[PDB]
């Protein structure tokens, strides 16, 4: 990497499971109380990480360096609809707000996000279309160094199976907050005044290999509680605006 | 709206009223009672049940005697002081609100809330997202045209200017982070049945409107745009019915004269 | 008032005040509490009793005139140290409060709270806003005159000076952000049934009262005004009835002499 | 009164201590707990037992003797934290089950975390929930209180001059005095409040005022004060007791020249 | 003692020691008991989470000593708590499983010697099981501060988290950071980022110095309670990653 502008943007859709053509942005209803010895969750019940590869102007070595990102979760006010489908809070009361466990995560890199597998239950039998830890053992419930993967397929890597790998990701920046619990309030902020700098302490940002920029996200907002009492994950899309400059390699 | 050398500062003050629905003449600042449990396939919210974005265009003094000149002057918005007005009104637990228990006081306003403002030199630009794309919205509202299942996530068709007061339902629209190059917007959504409202007042806080290059919103055709949504939470009537409560937002915006090409 | 330089000399006075709260004080024993809260009055017949309504506290601190000939000198407020007094009194869970469960301790004070202070060179300027414009307020209260539905959002008619102690109900009035050019105010409202009180004491915290140009509130008529509201939450009696509980607020204000033009 | 910091050999010292909590200690085995809490006493007949009332902790630390013809020790920094926060992860002993087949109920609810460093005893102001409370022998509480003692009564001034005597519910640090002390307290009230406690040997509180002057130690004595009521322990029966923990202090001091 | 500075990186994933009640429930404790009288409180080994520790040997440089300058650390697998289909009690009829929630402790340390610990007990009369190292000759004063209870974190899976805390009166040659959050319904809140570095230099710019060419990492990451369908509860813990930058420092003999 030697010394030494353009902007790209993306709306990245969430991958919550989409149990039918009308329920884009939701998961299938949650099952409960499967014994660890017989836990076979359906594909459409499992939120997955989102990713997109963004092609950049080819340059000939000059490389695009990501310098800043602006990002926010899109449609947060949609949760002020308490008239459609949600269980009443009490008799004559309005609908129950989306609430409970949530995960808000994004990454910007010059290559796919590197992940480490960890499982609640190693004996989980994951469905076709999902990519999950291979040859899991009891150690897969703590740290098992076999479970390395690239975030190289959209709507494939279940959020519950994978985390950003802090032992890799030399050429990406990632940020995530997990908040667990049945009554957790969603707290989401919007502003066009907030920028994250992507430069390390030596002043270098993600360098885009094969003229490619990779954005990654997961934005599980909480659980939607139907009138029947059934629960579904709700997700929202994440906007990215990335400022890049030419750097000489 | 009070609108008061080359270093001339104009201060624009205004109190923007909330638009929560106002279901009768006595419940200004409240919505109609919330319905619940409408199947997605038959969800027809009443007009007066839907809080909408508040907005106003504030005309500014004309700056340019000669419209033919190489350079023109524009009002540039440099700072805003803002706060929500009448937050103490929620200490009235004697009127209309369900008792917390037998012999107890009234239930405080609480639950999901949204506190949002914008200051720009053109209308706020908005992106539509829906809980439920099959929602049938009522006459008087402006809501995403020809929504699809993709409207429940991101559908780039749904672009609008916040160009009408009490028309754009908060539940359908967010500020568009892909536009608004000539506006600053700030919002926080806090969801949940029991969320406590937390609101601060002080005449000592100022938000700077200058971007990275030190440039504020530039007021196009001498027009300053203020936008707000202040849903404080849900009021619970003795019956158990719930209504949105909103409050007005004050703005004090300082502007200077910028030369442009 | 044209503001000139700070008058330096061999002479920064400090003044201090403990400002008692005005929660309603329903009898001789219940100083610091309101009357039991009523519930479920229809908006059309809402007549709260005076002793049920917390009011803004205010005191005027008199200062010596500085002018040998009626250029002049005014006292300028530079800083304030302030804190809520007796926060630990809520650790009394043996007196009066409803058991949390059988064989358990008393229920803590909790729920909606408001913590507000101001320091000005003149009375606090307030703006009226009502939950219910049809509320019939009791003798001894000063509340918005000729309210309309618009009084439930913003009605610019409702301007008042905080010119009387224990008269302006907290539920009717907020500091006016469109006035108070000669005062600094700070408030946080936290609403809800089960809100925990969170209160900090420290003698290391100073609020600077100086504006953008380094100018504090000026005591135009040789008076300093301190204003407060400290509703800590609701006390729940064994019976189920609820009362507001308030606590006094301490102020210590650093003053200097400021030159101004006649 | 205050001149230059004196440097030289032996112009700096550090002192440390662990101050035990004073939660009431209802028997020889329940050190660090209170007696079970009563409830619903009428204000007119409120007679709390001594062992039910947590009190402020205080200790005097002697410093190397300095000469008066003035040189004084100046407190510059304090490192402090609450000791034994992980003991609350014992959910097997004595605590009511959260539900059938469940673990014990964690300690939770109203808490107060307070410390002070001064060159004289902490100065306190009295405020009462109920001015008619009848406090027990062995406690020092607001003397001859009135209805005003429920808000602010300026008669209630005391020095924190006795360990395990000044009940926390009766007294606060007096912000109108303590010219020669720094204090820091947080009260969080409510039945379900979670304890939140941080430990780290990398956090330092600076005790210097805006002029760069720390507490000055009169007669070569340093005074530490604390209250760390962590919350309520719920027994199997439903009875509740306060739980407190010790507090560590590490105080760095330097010599300061002063003119009497 | 400590003179001029003369760079190497080491990394570790340290497993949690939550009790591991059977070969399938690695990362969990045995179900919690409740309501033992203080006079008859005999917790099983597998029910007690313990501090984790690893010693990392470094090249023998001989004085010159290895000096720990920075640490990046992260709890690993926080998203696994989004599995609400495996084994958790339903929140209500037709509902999803109950999240892990309740009392949690998140702690780490980097030192040039074993972590120095201080013993404090909920109940001094607690009778601890074989394989655990707990306060010796405890008294009622062991429920507050009893200075007898000093120990080195010198063994992995032995020192129960409920018995021991880092000693603020020692650990001159280590840096430690911990937060305890107690309560029935406390929400786990965990952040991941590869952009966060902790500086380990003291006031004089000296990091921990690796006595006998050993670096010591210590942790406890009790995430909260898992509630089984039956109502029984188990602690859940997760591994902690460490990446430590070290430099050579000249010292006097
Ligand atoms: Cl794998
Ligand atoms: Cl549209
Ligand atoms: Cl009026
Ligand atoms: Cl006294
Ligand atoms: Cl020991």
Author numbering:
A (entry chain CCC): 34 to 37, 44 to 99, 107 to 295
B (entry chain DDD): 32 to 35, 40 to 296
C (entry chain EEE): 32 to 42, 44 to 102, 106 to 297
D (entry chain AAA): 33 to 101, 107 to 297
E (entry chain BBB): 33 to 38, 44 to 99, 107 to 297
Paper text:
The E73Q pentamer structure was almost identical to that of the WT (RMSD in the BC loop region, from amino acids 68–76, of 0.5 Å), whereas the E73A mutant presenting an alanine in the same position showed some structural changes. The two variants having E to Q mutation at position 73, E73Q and VQQ bound, moreover, to a wider range of gangliosides of both a- and b-series including GD1a, GT1a, GD3, and GQ1b. As expected, infection was seen for WT in cells supplemented with GD1b, but also for E73Q and E73A PSVs under the same condition, and infection was also seen for E73Q when cells were supplemented with GD1a in both LNCaP and GM95 cells. The ability of the E73Q variant to infect cells supplemented with GD1a was consistent with its increased infectivity in RS cells, which carried GD1a gangliosides. Similarly, in 293TT cells, E73Q retained infectivity equivalent to that of WT VP1, whereas both VQQ and E73A showed significantly reduced infectivity. Therefore, flipping of the BC2 loop, and not loss of negative charge at position 73, was correlated with loss of infectivity in 293TT cells.
BK polyomavirus (BKPyV) is a small, non-enveloped, double-stranded DNA virus with an icosahedral capsid formed by 72 capsomers, where a capsomer is an association of a pentamer of the VP1 protein linked internally to a single copy of either the VP2 or the VP3 proteins. BK polyomavirus (BKPyV) is an opportunistic pathogen that uses the b-series gangliosides GD1b and GT1b as entry receptors. All variant VP1 pentamer structures were globally similar to the WT VP1 pentamer with a doughnut-shaped ring composed of a central pore surrounded by five VP1 monomers in 5-fold symmetry.
